[PDB]
């Protein structure tokens, strides 16, 4: 696993998220479930906990965007860059933007929202890319049809626990 230069990390264990907008690709509850499960992945192996906000500035603001969207990194149309997320910190840091030029799906027929979201939240929490091929934090989106088997790899658990430690009890 790779942590980020300077090892920026959250100095608190309780983090808020806000789903700022919704893609036309899916039912709103599918977007909610995907994001909720993505957080869970990481919540499960650390003392981090998450709560959702519906107004104000949450630590992790989540949105869908197309091309230019308010930061210096425009999205790029279909495929390639699927999303991006900023390392821990204030304001735009911690935030995650998903390219709506992708077709987000609950399954693997398009771009799986839960999988990319689990990866991006890894970034929002302090993990950079891993050199390990079976890690979620590996840069490589394969269209893993088999989400039925998903498990955070040990390398991901090692990286995230190196930042925040294991679960307390």
Binding site for Zn(2+), by residue number, is: 69, 71, 84, 97, 119, 123, 129
Helix (H, G, I), strand (E, B) or coil at 8: coil
Taking CB under 5 A as the rule, does residue 126 contact Ca ion?
A: no
Strands (E), 66-165: 83-85, 96-99, 104-105, 111-112
Alpha carbons 89 and 47: distance in angstroms, whole number: 18
Cα–Cα nearest to 113, from 90, 144, 75, 69: 144
Nearest distance from C-beta of residue 32 to Ca ion, angstroms: 17
- Given 62, 83, 88, 97, the residue binding Zn ion (CB under 5 A): 97
Choices 5-13, 29-37, 90-98, 134-142; region in contact with Ca ion by CB under 5 A: 90-98
Residues 61-87: b if buried by 16+ CB within 10 A, e if exposed? bbbbbeeeeeeeeebeeeeeebbbbbb
Residue number, 47 or 132, with CB nearest to Zn ion: 132
Which residue shows structure tokens 């992708």? 102
Extract the annotated binding site for Ca(2+): 25, 59, 76-77, 79, 81, 91, 93, 95, 99-100, 102
Least distance from Ca ion to the Cβ atom of residue 92, Å: 6
Told to check if 120 binds Ca ion by CB under 5 A, we report no
Q: Find all residues with CB under 8 Å of 126, minimum gap 6, and list them.
A: 3, 4, 7, 8, 9, 10, 87, 88, 160, 163
Closer to Zn ion by Cβ: residue 71 or 134: 71
The one of Ca ion, Zn ion, none whose footprint includes residue 36, by CB under 5 to 8 A per kind, is none
Based on the shown chain and the rule CB under 5 A, indicate whether residue 64 belongs to the binding site for Zn ion. no
Chain contacts with Zn ion (rule: CB under 5 A)? 71, 97
Q: Which residues are catalytic?
A: 120
């Amino acid at each position: 696993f790779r942590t980020f230069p300077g090892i920026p990390k959250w100095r608190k264990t309780h983090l808020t998220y806000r789903i700022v907008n919704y893609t036309p690709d899916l039912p709103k509850d599918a977007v909610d479930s995907a994001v909720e499960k993505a957080l869970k992945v990481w919540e499960e192996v650390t003392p981090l906990t998450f709560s959702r906000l519906y107004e104000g500035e949450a630590d992790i603001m989540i949105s869908f965007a197309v091309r230019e969207h308010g930061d210096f990194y425009p999205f790029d149309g279909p495929g390639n860059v699927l999303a991006h997320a900023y390392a821990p910190g204030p304001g735009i840091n911690g935030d995650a933007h998903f390219d709506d030029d992708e077709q987000w799906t609950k399954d693997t027929t398009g771009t799986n929202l839960f999988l990319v979201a689990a990866h991006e939240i890894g970034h929002s929490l302090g993990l950079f890319h891993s050199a390990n091929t079976e890690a979620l934090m590996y840069p490589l989106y394969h269209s893993l049809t088999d989400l039925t088997r998903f498990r955070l790899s040990q390398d991901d658990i090692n990286g995230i626990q190196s930042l925040y430690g294991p679960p307390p009890d």
